[PDB]
Amino acid sequence: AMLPISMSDEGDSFLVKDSLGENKIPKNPSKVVILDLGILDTFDALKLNDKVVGVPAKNLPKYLQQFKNKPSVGGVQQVDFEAINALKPDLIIISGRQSKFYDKLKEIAPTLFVGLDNANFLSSFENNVLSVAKLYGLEKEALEKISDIKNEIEKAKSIVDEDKKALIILTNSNKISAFGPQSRFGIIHDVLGINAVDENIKVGTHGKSINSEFILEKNPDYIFVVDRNVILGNERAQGILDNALVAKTKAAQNKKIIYLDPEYWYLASGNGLESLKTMILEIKNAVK
Ligand SMILES: O=C(NCCCCCCNC(=O)c1cccc(O)c1O)c1cccc(O)c1O
Numbered sequence: 001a002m003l004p005i006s007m008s009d010e011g012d013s014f015l016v017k018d019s020l021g022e023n024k025i026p027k028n029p030s031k032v033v034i035l036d037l038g039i040l041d042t043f044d045a046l047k048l049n050d051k052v053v054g055v056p057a058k059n060l061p062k063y064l065q066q067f068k069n070k071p072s073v074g075g076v077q078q079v080d081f082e083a084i085n086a087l088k089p090d091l092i093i094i095s096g097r098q099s100k101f102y103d104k105l106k107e108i109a110p111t112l113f114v115g116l117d118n119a120n121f122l123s124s125f126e127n128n129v130l131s132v133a134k135l136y137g138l139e140k141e142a143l144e145k146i147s148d149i150k151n152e153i154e155k156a157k158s159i160v161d162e163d164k165k166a167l168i169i170l171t172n173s174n175k176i177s178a179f180g181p182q183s184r185f186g187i188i189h190d191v192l193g194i195n196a197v198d199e200n201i202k203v204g205t206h207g208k209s210i211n212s213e214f215i216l217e218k219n220p221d222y223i224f225v226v227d228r229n230v231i232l233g234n235e236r237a238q239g240i241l242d243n244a245l246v247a248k249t250k251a252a253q254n255k256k257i258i259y260l261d262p263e264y265w266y267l268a269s270g271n272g273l274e275s276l277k278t279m280i281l282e283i284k285n286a287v288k
């Protein structure tokens with residue numbers, strides 16, 4: 001279990017511990033650079049857009065184009081450190097993609113880690129949202145939003161077929177890899193109750209290498225596809241999965257090859273009030 005975010009009220013600020021370290025963070029930071037696209041969407045959901053002074057515009061999702069106003073701090077894998085310095089932020093918010101540059105970032109300004117725990121998605125998700133909301137006095141609003149998300153989870157959990165199995169896959173160039181429970185997309189199995197065609201897929205950040213022979217041998221009832229091409233600006237998932245083998249699966253037969261929106265699933269990783277809700281609905285609409 002990843003250490004949670006913990007905070008102590010210091011009057012004009014909070015003293016804040018997370019899994020990478022500790023920071024004094026002002027109440028109401030007014031100049032926040034945000035490198036997690038999920039948190040950006042939480043900032044939008046809580047009407048905190050004017051607090052955001054820089055975003056990774058090379059990877060700004062279509063669903064967050066209201067932020068194309070903001071100065072750019074590069075990409076999520078290509079941080080523009082000079083632009084971050086030059087903006088003189090009072091807070092920087094990162095997740096897993098920037099952990100290795102923690103120290104550089106913290107030299108510049110207080111740097112908060114809001115990564116998701118793959119083994120405890122929901123508790124880490126609520127902890128991230130609330131920790132952010134608490135900086136602004138908005139815990140009440142945030143908890144209401146979270147409670148709405150949980151009604152969706154409970155509903156979605158109910159319309160679930162106990163006898164059908166899913167495979168989660170990610171496509172990239174002409175390469176497929178597999179994800180299962182406890183992975184960066186595990187909410188599908190771990191939270192929404194959809195069974196896994198294969199319980200022993202080793203968790204890895206960009207998945208474990210497979211091919212279409214594997215997909216047909218497993219013969220899942222659903223295939224959830226996350227097309228990383230779209231994120232990288234590349235060809236498409238429909239290409240590599242247009243083959244005779246995939247076409248024979250139960251998932252093809254029953255029109256359950258579901259292309260998940262990668263901006264939400266890959267980039268945001270469901271780490272926001274908006275993305276997570278949309279993602280619950282997407283799965284719910286794709287499986288009923
Ligand atoms: O540490 C990470 N990546 C290091 C960069 C090595 C990846 C090579 C190419 N990646 C990309 O160009 C890329 C671009 C945008 C978003 C991404 O995730 C990407 O991997 C990382 C961490 C959590 C989740 C990810 O997914 C990551 O990668």
Ligand SMILES: [Fe+3]
Pocket residue numbers: 206
């Ligand atoms: Fe990546």
